[PDB]
Design a protein around this nucleic acid. Structure first.
Lengths: 129, 63, 145, 158
RNA sequence: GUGGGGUAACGGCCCACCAAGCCGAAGAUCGGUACGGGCCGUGAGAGCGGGAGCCCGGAGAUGGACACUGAGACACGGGUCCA
RNA sequence: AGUGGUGGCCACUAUUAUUGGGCCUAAAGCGGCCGUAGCCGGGCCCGUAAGUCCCUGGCGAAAUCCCACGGCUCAACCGUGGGGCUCGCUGGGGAUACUGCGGGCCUUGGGACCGGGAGAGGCCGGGGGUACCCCCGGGGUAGGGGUGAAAUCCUAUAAUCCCGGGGGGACCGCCAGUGGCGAAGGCGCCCGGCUGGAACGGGUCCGACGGUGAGCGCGGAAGGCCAGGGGAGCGAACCGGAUUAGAUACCCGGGUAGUCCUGGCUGUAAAGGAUGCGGGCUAGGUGUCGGGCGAGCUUCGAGCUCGCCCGGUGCCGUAGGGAAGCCGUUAA
């Protein structure tokens, strides 16, 4: 069935971009999607985004800049401490200064640099570059 | 179909005005079951799969 | 995936998968058991002495040629039969029967051997605790016996 | 949709009506339509067949979209209304029909023997009923003390 | 479970009575191997491998059994006895 | 003042894959399903704060380890200070995105409903013809048969040949299509009844009931095993003949179990798409089967066709993947 929906929503977004399509229609539809979209949009790695509110199936329509090369989620969703944020960013990711290791904290979704500033992590949700 | 931006069927509504007793019914355009009059028990439509075959001659106004 | 227990508390499943498949290496299974120890006649030791039962020679295989000088030994360490390859140039003068001969492994326990030998895994370093290898060389000690 | 469980092909592409704005092309009230449901249930119709009737005759889009809510039970439509009246048993109509088929099959296999195809189908229907029931007993759609075994099935049918 | 003995003392430790429980696939039970730890060896790490001098705690003193004196031994150069 | 050898361990070895490996063809998909334990869960809200993050404080002996300085000519080393130590345990305060649980809620997943329709799906009964065979009668002589050539063999009160009749078993050329049905093994004469499943349009119904699934359970071609019946043709064994040096074999003449049917039993396959199962997502084009829908043609029947739409089977091919061959919405 449909399980782990978020990974899937990121995965569609990667295929779109590999093709170099203008936009994406996300069939999955959550608070999680929209807060993650807001984080993406502050960095300006995505463009403008629309949420239509339907209760048949909410849709998000996303503009692609093409600045996200790959974005996917974590297989265990294993937890991450504050000291440990760097360890996961070098280890897995090619990034070093791109500043998104997206993590969920008690406030919503944060990036890497944003997690340091607050001082709070949680469970590691995903990554973006 | 219409799956990405609002799922929509093949349907519509029409008002039928009977001539066998003049009762005014709103009817769904894919009869799956026969429709009866509320005052004669007479058949407006007979169903065939998807869109039913319209029995006799009965007027329809398409809303 | 195409496979795995990736869940949070699934991890015991994954850990067992790996544990069974690790046994598929012979070299891992041997060493943990003590099968290695038991099988080799020196008993996991670098060398053992024994008495030369008799001087036999072994035949070369099909690629190759050459009739190799050899000793069949009975270890004084245990009570087992070993086949041990004796080098030497004119080898047989240096080597001597019914004296005490000391045998070592060679080349690891890879199980393989050279081509000139049908299956000999062993080396004779020493005869009466003075090496054969000194007698091969002209620069430490020139032929004796 | 698409799922596979006794077919090697996908599911049908049908969807619910999206006229999620209340009717106004209907010209009957909520009141008249309830009245109809009592008479039809009493007649001998089962609750799926009533709702089909309501869509054709009385012209509503869905029966979820002209009568939700009006009683405070989940997913308010027909059988919840009936349930408060006592015109519907607690065991969902879904389950009543599944169970009825599962009885029908033992009786054919007997008379017609050497049925391989029909025998595999008897295993398959039954199996599905235990899994549905296991969730229902908990939910309170069925009693906690209820069990689904094939003898109890035959009882209900008779 | 209940009562009791005995111990420095809790205790099916031992005992009488009364009950039929207790344990198990997240691996019981059985066979087999092994002093354990700080650490150490290796490896960029993850990990792998190890328990040696040395320090820490327990165990032993030809094999087994046994008491006495002492806060403390069932006693490593003490006794009794059996092999 | 070692060098070299053997034995062992760790790196090299993503040859144990967590970092960091795979399963069309290299080693690797279970013949298929079912559903248990276990693992995993759509959207929206709410309670708890168990998981999860933060802070303080108790503590994880010395030694070993790093850094610093000092002493011994020097350094190893040891002192001293600082930092760190297998670091597995403890208590209180806070946060609530994410997860766990209890409650409420929604149709998007799942199961379920109704109507036209197709089919070699299954079970039973009836029945036709073609062709073979046997036997009866007629007709009709000398070879028939078999092969690459032969030979064995078969035939004279008569075989082969040719007609008419009756009986019997077995199966269904044409139909038949790159076609259709079933979970899978698999399923083809025609007619009727009984019966299972599916695509589809209309979501009418329960409201997360879901996915996967170790174990367990079940089906399982052919042949075999057991009983009974059936036996026309076919044919392991077998008995001749040829071929061949010899045939142990290809070839030919005979021929038994068996092949057929029912009851019972066992379980294998290169049981193949060598491609585990469920979902989302990622260029298209053309044909074809069945459904929905709008037409044209019409023999007025969806008969012939086109497009949109829904599912399935095929060919060509993009992004990508692959060692390459290929694969490519039916994904490798």
């Amino acid at each position: 069935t449909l399980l782990d929906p978020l990974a899937n929503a990121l995965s569609h977004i990667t295929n779109s971009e590999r093709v170099g399509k203008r936009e994406v229609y996300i069939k999955p539809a959550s608070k999680l999607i929209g807060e993650v979209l807001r984080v993406m949009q502050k960095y300006g790695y995505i463009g403008e985004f629309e949420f239509i509110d339907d209760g048949r199936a909410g849709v998000y329509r996303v503009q692609l800049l093409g600045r996200i090369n790959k974005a996917g989620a974590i297989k265990p969703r294993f937890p991450v401490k504050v000291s440990e944020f760097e360890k996961w960013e070098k280890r897995f990711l090619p990034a070093f200064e791109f500043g998104i290791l997206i993590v969920s904290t008690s406030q919503g979704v944060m990036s890497h640099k944003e997690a340091i500033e607050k001082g709070i992590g949680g469970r590691l949700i995903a990554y973006v570059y | 179909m219409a799956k990405p931006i609002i799922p929509m069927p093949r349907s519509r509504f029409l008002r039928v005005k009977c001539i066998d007793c003049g009762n005014e019914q709103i009817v769904f355009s894919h009869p799956a079951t026969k429709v009866r009059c509320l005052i004669c028990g007479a058949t407006l439509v007979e169903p065939t799969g998807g869109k039913g075959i319209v029995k006799a001659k009965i007027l329809e106004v398409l809303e | 995936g195409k496979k795995a227990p990736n869940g949070e508390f699934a991890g015991r499943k994954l850990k067992l998968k790996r544990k069974k498949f690790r046994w598929s290496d012979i070299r891992y299974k041997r060493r943990v058991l003590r099968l290695k120890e038991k099988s080799d006649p020196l008993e996991g030791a670098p060398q053992a002495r024994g008495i030369v039962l008799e001087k036999i020679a072994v035949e070369a295989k099909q690629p190759n040629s050459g009739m190799r000088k050899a000793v069949r030994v009975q270890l004084i360490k245990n009570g087992k039969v070993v086949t041990a390859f004796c080098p030497g140039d004119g080898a047989i003068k240096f080597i001597d029967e019914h004296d005490e001969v000391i045998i070592e492994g060679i080349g690891g326990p890879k199980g393989g051997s050279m081509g000139d030998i049908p299956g000999i895994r062993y080396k004779v370093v020493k005869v009466n605790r003075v090496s054969l290898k000194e007698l091969v060389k002209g620069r430490k000690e020139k032929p004796r016996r | 949709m698409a799922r596979m469980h006794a077919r090697k092909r996908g599911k049908s592409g049908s969807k619910r009506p999206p006229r999620t704005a209340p009717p106004i092309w209907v010209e009957y009230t909520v009141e008249e339509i309830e009245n109809l449901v009592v008479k039809l249930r009493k007649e001998g119709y089962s609750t799926a067949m009533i709702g089909t009737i309501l869509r054709d005759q009385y012209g509503i889009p869905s029966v979820k979209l002209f009568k939700d809510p009006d009683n405070p039970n989940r997913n308010l439509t027909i059988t919840r209304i009936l349930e408060k009246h006592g015109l519907a048993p607690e065991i969902p109509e879904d389950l009543m029909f599944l169970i009825r088929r599962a009885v029908n099959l033992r009786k054919h296999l007997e008379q017609h023997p050497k049925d391989l195809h029909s025998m595999r189908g008897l295993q398959l229907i039954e199996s599905k009923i235990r899994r549905l029931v296991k969730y229902y007993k908990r939910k309170g759609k069925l009693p906690k003390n209820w069990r689904y075994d094939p003898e109890t099935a035959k009882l209900l049918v008779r």
